[PDB]
Amino acid sequence: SKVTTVVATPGQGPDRPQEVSYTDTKVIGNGSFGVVYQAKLCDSGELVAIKKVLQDKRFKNRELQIMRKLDHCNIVRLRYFFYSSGEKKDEVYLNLVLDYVPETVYRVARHYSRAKQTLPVIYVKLYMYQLFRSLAYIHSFGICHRDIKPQNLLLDPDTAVLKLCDFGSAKQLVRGEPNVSYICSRYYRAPELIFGATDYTSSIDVWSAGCVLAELLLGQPIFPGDSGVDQLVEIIKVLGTPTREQIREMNPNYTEFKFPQIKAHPWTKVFRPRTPPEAIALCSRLLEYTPTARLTPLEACAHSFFDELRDPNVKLPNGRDTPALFNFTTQELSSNPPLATILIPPHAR
Numbered sequence: 001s002k003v004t005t006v007v008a009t010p011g012q013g014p015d016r017p018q019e020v021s022y023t024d025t026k027v028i029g030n031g032s033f034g035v036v037y038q039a040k041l042c043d044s045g046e047l048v049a050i051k052k053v054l055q056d057k058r059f060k061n062r063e064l065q066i067m068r069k070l071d072h073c074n075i076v077r078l079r080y081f082f083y084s085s086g087e088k089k090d091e092v093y094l095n096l097v098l099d100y101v102p103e104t105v106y107r108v109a110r111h112y113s114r115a116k117q118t119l120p121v122i123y124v125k126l127y128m129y130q131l132f133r134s135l136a137y138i139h140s141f142g143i144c145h146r147d148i149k150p151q152n153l154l155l156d157p158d159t160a161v162l163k164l165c166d167f168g169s170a171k172q173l174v175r176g177e178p179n180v181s182y183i184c185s186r187y188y189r190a191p192e193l194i195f196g197a198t199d200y201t202s203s204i205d206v207w208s209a210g211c212v213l214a215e216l217l218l219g220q221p222i223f224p225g226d227s228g229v230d231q232l233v234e235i236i237k238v239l240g241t242p243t244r245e246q247i248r249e250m251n252p253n254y255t256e257f258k259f260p261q262i263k264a265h266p267w268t269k270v271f272r273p274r275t276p277p278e279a280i281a282l283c284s285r286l287l288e289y290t291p292t293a294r295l296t297p298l299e300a301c302a303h304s305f306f307d308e309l310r311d312p313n314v315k316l317p318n319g320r321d322t323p324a325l326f327n328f329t330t331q332e333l334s335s336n337p338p339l340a341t342i343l344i345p346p347h348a349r
């Protein structure tokens with residue numbers, strides 16, 4: 001076996017690097033970011049992920065600066081960070097030692113779809129609540145993920161703990177400062193972004209989460225668009241044609257898509273029979289045309305659909321106890337503090 005010893009700066013605490021050794025490196029991910037590895041530590045024998053990205057002198061890494069401000073159980077923790085040379089030494093890379101999680105929400109949802117089965121509502125409740133909890137934390141700093149999809153939602157099959165990953169698209173949204181329109185994966189792309197909105201709030205992650213929720217309820221994406229324009233046709237097929245005021249509320253740059261008035265399709269008819277009415281009520285308040293009309297991540301966590309997790313007698317289908325879901329902080333509750341009366345039940349008080 002080959003051992004790799006490097007001096008890496010820890011993500012949290014003071015900027016003081018330490019000698020970190022790792023072995024058994026293998027390629028597990030490949031994307032727009034760069035490359036993701038899986039390595040075993042020499043100290044505890046713990047498995048960690050190493051995301052190698054090509055870095056320049058012109059500026060500092062945007063993802064790294066967002067990552068070392070973040071400390072939450074439902075987001076992959078930045079263990080360490082170091083610099084390596086792999087292009088005749090003239091070009092340098094940024095390696096991010098992050099948490100390793102075996103499965104993803106996509107892979108778990110795929111298992112049921114291939115077996116013609118439905119994902120149990122308890123799993124839909126646990127995965128969605130943890131996504132909105134991590135969203136309430138990132139949005140309190142002004143940071144918007146801009147890439148919410150089941151492939152980026154990591155999963156541990158035994159404990160059922162969800163973790164958010166890939167903060168490359170992520171940016172601290174500021175009022176007045178424009179942003180790029182073509183962002184997020186097509187099936188989870190908000191209608192503002194299709195309408196060419198450069199000025200948007202962190203409510204685009206709320207829409208993307210709503211797209212994931214409906215996907216876990218249907219067993220397939222709700223809006224499978226063939227093109228960038230065919231994506232809006234998929235949305236119009238269930239939500240109907242947006243009103244004059246709904247269009248303006250998205251703040252659209254260069255509009256006039258020229259589509260016929262088809263009108264909204266009932267939410268109950270969209271999903272399978274005997275689908276919990278609370279899931280539909282939640283999905284209706286997340287997948288809204290008007291971004292300001294959408295439920296906030298904390299408001300989504302306080303919804304009637306996640307009341308089963310708030311029960312003191314709730315447990316995982318494998319017998320194990322549900323993870324920490326009520327250990328909220330002042331930074332998490334920052335947007336709406338009186339919501340703590342619903343979010344934190346008397347048993348956990």
Ligand SMILES: CC(=O)c1ccc2c(c1)/C(=C(/NC1CCN(C)CC1)c1ccccc1)C(=O)N2
Nearest residue numbers: 028029036049076098099100101102103165166
């Ligand atoms: C993208 C990023 O920033 C990041 C950060 C930390 C991470 C991962 C990704 C990650 C991934 N793990 C997969 C390993 C293979 N199994 C079968 C599925 C899960 C992974 C890799 C590529 C795409 C999506 C997810 C993990 O375990 N820890």
